[PDB]
Scaffold this active site. Sequence first.
Site, mmCIF file in Angstrom:
data_model
loop_
_atom_site.group_PDB
_atom_site.id
_atom_site.type_symbol
_atom_site.label_atom_id
_atom_site.label_comp_id
_atom_site.label_asym_id
_atom_site.label_seq_id
_atom_site.Cartn_x
_atom_site.Cartn_y
_atom_site.Cartn_z
ATOM 1 N N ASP A 35 0.833 -1.201 0.000
ATOM 2 C CA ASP A 35 0.000 0.000 0.000
ATOM 3 C C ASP A 35 0.874 1.260 0.000
ATOM 4 O O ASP A 35 1.374 1.676 1.052
ATOM 5 C CB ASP A 35 -0.890 -0.022 1.249
ATOM 6 C CG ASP A 35 -1.836 1.151 1.314
ATOM 7 O OD1 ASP A 35 -1.969 1.866 0.299
ATOM 8 O OD2 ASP A 35 -2.422 1.363 2.396
ATOM 9 N N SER A 199 -0.564 15.728 -11.948
ATOM 10 C CA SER A 199 -0.815 15.355 -13.330
ATOM 11 C C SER A 199 -1.060 16.620 -14.142
ATOM 12 O O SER A 199 -1.616 17.603 -13.643
ATOM 13 C CB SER A 199 -2.031 14.433 -13.407
ATOM 14 O OG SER A 199 -2.392 14.143 -14.740
#
Length: 330
Positions: A35, A199
């Site tokens: 994770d 992004s």
Amino acid sequence: STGSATTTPIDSLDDAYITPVQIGTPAQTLNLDFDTGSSDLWVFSSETTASEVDGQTIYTPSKSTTAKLLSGATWSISYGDGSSSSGDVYTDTVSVGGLTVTGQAVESAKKVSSSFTEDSTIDGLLGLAFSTLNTVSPTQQKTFFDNAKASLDSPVFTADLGYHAPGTYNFGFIDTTAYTGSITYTAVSTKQGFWEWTSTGYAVGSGTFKSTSIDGIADTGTTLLYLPATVVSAYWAQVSGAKSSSSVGGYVFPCSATLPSFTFGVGSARIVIPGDYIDFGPISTGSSSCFGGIQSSAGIGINIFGDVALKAAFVVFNGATTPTLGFASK
């Protein structure tokens, strides 16, 4: 040193991936959920409340010659889905794909919430976010990667998750045969303890890419792609019959639909998520309505590039002094 381990989807939807991890001496192999959105390595154990164990493999520290109880230490974690676990703390020898860390904090669960009990395939979590998120008290402990770092040939790990198929976590090296083209690297902020990056925009299907900054985290422990409501609405508007259902808890669409791809930007580069990756199957058994793999992050408080996005790429988690993320197509 290096390590290399295969990671395998737990079910037919790629809800999560499990990677075998050797703990203790002699080794006890547990299948853990790696994770990158948390920082605790915790396991089902001989100390876990018996009624909360249902099919998991447990760690038994009393059978390990190298286990050491961290006196007085406790841990307690709550995840975004409302699940939780807590307990006490050992150190022990932990190996992943041939890479060994001695003295790794192994957090033994005394209590786990129902979601964990009900998932027989996951024996615990191995956190790979920054150690500043670790929940051990009174003294925070380091992640497996943080402990391994100085020994690694290069201070990196890579995630290469499969679509309905196994993939690979590598530590300490970049497998230049595992991707196409080049890896584009992008800046990381560690201010919130995550592999947080920005992004450069998105496209829906064959549409023209929209340049716009989207801050979010690279999170292997989250199944779906969670993005701003504007972006997600633009995507599902291109799917006939798609709608947001408050009763189901997100966007649904007719299972017969052909889904468009979704592209996200990494600098001037682009990662294309095929439409099929966005199909999470019938909302309930036998339904002709299917659950979408791109959902709104509104109300989470952060955008999450989870497995739906990451499995479309070869992803480098660069833990150098100034961390960065790399993405390549594959």
